[PDB]
């Protein structure tokens, strides 16, 4: 027994901003149908690949980013398996200042959303298969921090004229461009004089192509961060990291079009 008198069969609980959680959920739903969240003393983590193994999403909310957070004493790790379409339903109404509370046991997951009304949901805790790529030294030849709205608008424009986007980094610039025969070719060239280019480090030149449809879906989460940290190498995966001011983090990995 604990000094808590409410919800004493649950193994973990947290409280968080429902609107930010809705944005984190949506970011995952672009990649995964079902996700396995893990709750530990460090906070909340999810990582998984889509079925084609072409894209990955990784969510981290440090325990210090939560309004409240605790785990039962006999437990180091608590899994939360959930379908992302169902979870969007739970937090669909969310506005600024609405709080979400989540309590987790092995067989069930309680969600309480404080919105216009108090919404309560009780979900089964799903068994979810996690697939992740092999853990190796991923080397990135090129890294750039860019204002996220500029990347999103670039991808919008590229998609007008083709379905592949090329990232071209030289020593002192980053070019994002459409390819293929439709005209005019769209090109956003950033240099260290561009306000949009916060930082650029290029170890070696890198040129890679990616599915713009997929990247566009990924940039849906741009409204959680002012800037995006991009990393890539020639004919290797692009990594994109969105760092929220509250400390939560969304990372994506996207395999190249070859």
Numbering used by the authors: 5 to 262
From the paper:
Among these factors, proliferating cell nuclear antigen (PCNA) forms a trimeric ring (sliding clamp) around DNA and directly enhances the activity of proteins involved in replication. Several enzymes bind to PCNA via the PCNA-interacting peptide-box (PIP-box) motif, including DNA-dependent DNA polymerases, flap endonucleases and DNA ligases involved in DNA replication. Analysis of the A. pernix genome showed that the sequence contains three PCNA genes: ApePCNA1 (APE_0162), ApePCNA2 (APE_0441.1) and ApePCNA3 (APE_2182) in the KEGG database. The sliding clamp of A. pernix forms heterotrimers and enhances polymerase activity in the ApePCNA1–ApePCNA2–ApePCNA3 and ApePCNA2–ApePCNA3 complexes.
The crystal structure contains a single ApePCNA1 subunit within the asymmetric unit. The crystals did not contain a threefold axis and the subunits did not form a ring-shaped trimeric structure. The ApePCNA1 subunit is composed of N- and C-terminal domains and a long loop called the inter-domain-connecting loop (IDCL) that connects the two domains formed by Leu130–Gln145. The PCNA rings from other species have an inward α-helix region. The positive surface charge of the α-helix region suggests that ApePCNA1 has an α-helix region located in the inner part of the ring that interacts with the negative charge of the DNA double helix like that in other species. In general, the C-terminal side of the sliding clamp is considered to be the direction of DNA replication, and a group of enzymes responsible for DNA replication bind to the binding pocket near the IDCL. Interestingly, the N-terminus of ApePCNA1 interacted with the cleavage groove of the adjacent ApePCNA1 molecule. In this interaction, the carboxyl group of the N-terminal Asp8 is connected to Arg57 of the neighboring subunit by a hydrogen bond. The hydrophobic side chain of Leu7 is placed in a hydrophobic pocket formed by Met53, Leu60, Pro137, Pro241, Leu257 and Ala259 in an adjacent subunit. The consensus sequence of the PIP-box is QXXhXXaa, where X is any amino acid, h is a hydrophobic amino acid and a is an aromatic amino acid. The 4-EATLDSEF-11 sequence in the N-terminal region of ApePCNA1 is similar to the consensus sequence of the PIP-box. Furthermore, the N-terminal region of ApePCNA1 was suggested to be an anchor sequence that induces PIP-box binding. These results suggest that ApePCNA1 has an unknown function mediated by an N-terminal anchor sequence that results in PIP-box-like interactions.
